[PDB]
Amino acid sequence: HVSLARGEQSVKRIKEFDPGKDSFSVLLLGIDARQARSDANVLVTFNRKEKTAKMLSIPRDAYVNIPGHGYDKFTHAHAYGGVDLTVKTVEEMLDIPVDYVVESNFTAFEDVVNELNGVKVTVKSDKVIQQIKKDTKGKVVLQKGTHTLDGEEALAYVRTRKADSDLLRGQRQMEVLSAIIDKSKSDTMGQNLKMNLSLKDAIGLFPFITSLKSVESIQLTGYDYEPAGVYYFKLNQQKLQEVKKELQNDLGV
Ligand SMILES: CC(=O)N[C@H]1[C@@H](OP(=O)(O)OP(=O)(O)OC/C=C(/C)CC/C=C(/C)CC/C=C(\C)CC/C=C(\C)CC/C=C(\C)CCC=C(C)C)O[C@H](CO)[C@@H](O)[C@@H]1O
Ligand SMILES: [Cl-]
């Protein structure tokens, strides 16, 4: 439990936030704790009235303004100013409140998956199986079809990446995240999960999160921007404005 420097509720909210009755957002950050850059960056917005969730993967190389540091790769916000600055960067990029944030290292992820007795993933790509084999020196060998993956297998699945674009990797992360929720429908954190709300409050949201009528994914499209060999992902501004309106409406702001 670690409070954000911004205060009791997001500065983006014009009205008083009621966590038990309002739609809300959660930012999930995956870190390699070998500050560190954020390699997994998933924002989930929950529509309380409609009992729906929308997942969004923020491209790690998205070309965005990092407050106090200028335009740069989104992933660097966590390196320059930790969770506080990542939250500020998201709130500026999408013009929405980030109500809750959860920061995880490899160990917390593996322990969560294993405590759930694995998570179900339908593997479909020989190329993905092959690249994971390469990543792990053959320690992780996935099979096509629907199988229950343990923590090590799931972790390798959400880490693998062919080249610059983390498009497919973000989709694998949202896939596994939703599988974790599915498996939970039926203490462990330790010092490896950091979140800006109490364990008690986190549990109070569990019934709502695990009884959603629908889960959907949305995308920030764009194109490669390589001004001097340094790779950025420039966001399509029309799609960005579309996503912003969609999440603003979901959050009732
Ligand atoms: C393996 C690889 O290929 N690496 C590439 C490169 O480095 P990289 O791209 O940074 O990857 P990496 O450093 O190894 O691992 C770091 C990568 C990632 C994606 C970080 C993963 C970290 C995690 C903690 C797991 C992923 C996060 C997910 C699925 C979302 C959040 C998950 C959480 C919070 C865990 C439990 C979930 C909970 C509590 C959800 C409940 C709450 C709600 C639903 C509101 O290195 C070479 C050149 O340098 C390249 O050639 C090479 O391709
Ligand atoms: Cl696959």
Same domain as 184, residue 66: no
Same domain as 145, residue 120: yes
Technique used by the depositors: X-ray
Mutation choice for ligand 1 from 47, 104, 121, CB with most ligand atoms inside 8 A: 104
Contact present, 75 and 30 (Cβ < 8 Å): no
Same domain as 135, residue 93: no
Breaks in the chain, named by the residue before each, with C–N above 2.5 Å?
A: 34, 186
Mutation choice for ligand 1 from 29, 159, 164, CB with most ligand atoms inside 8 A: 159
Same domain as 89, residue 5: yes
SS percent in the chain: helix, strand, coil, step 5:
35, 25, 40
- Domain end call among 189, 209, 232: 189
Instruction: Tally Cβ neighbours within 10 Å of residue 12.
Output: 18
Resolution expressed in Å: 1.6
Question: Domain with 148 in it: what CATH number?
Answer: 3.40.630.190
- Domain end call among 167, 189, 211: 189
Same domain as 100, residue 10: yes
Same domain as 162, residue 88: no
| Count of domains observed in the chain | 2
* Widest CA span in the chain: 53
Tokens of 205: 């949201």
- Domain end call among 133, 163, 189: 189
DSSP string, 139-206: S----SEEEEE-HHHHHHHHH--SSS--HHHHHHHHHHHHHHHHHHT--TTTTSEEESS-HHHHHHHH
Q: Which domain holds residue 133?
A: 106-189
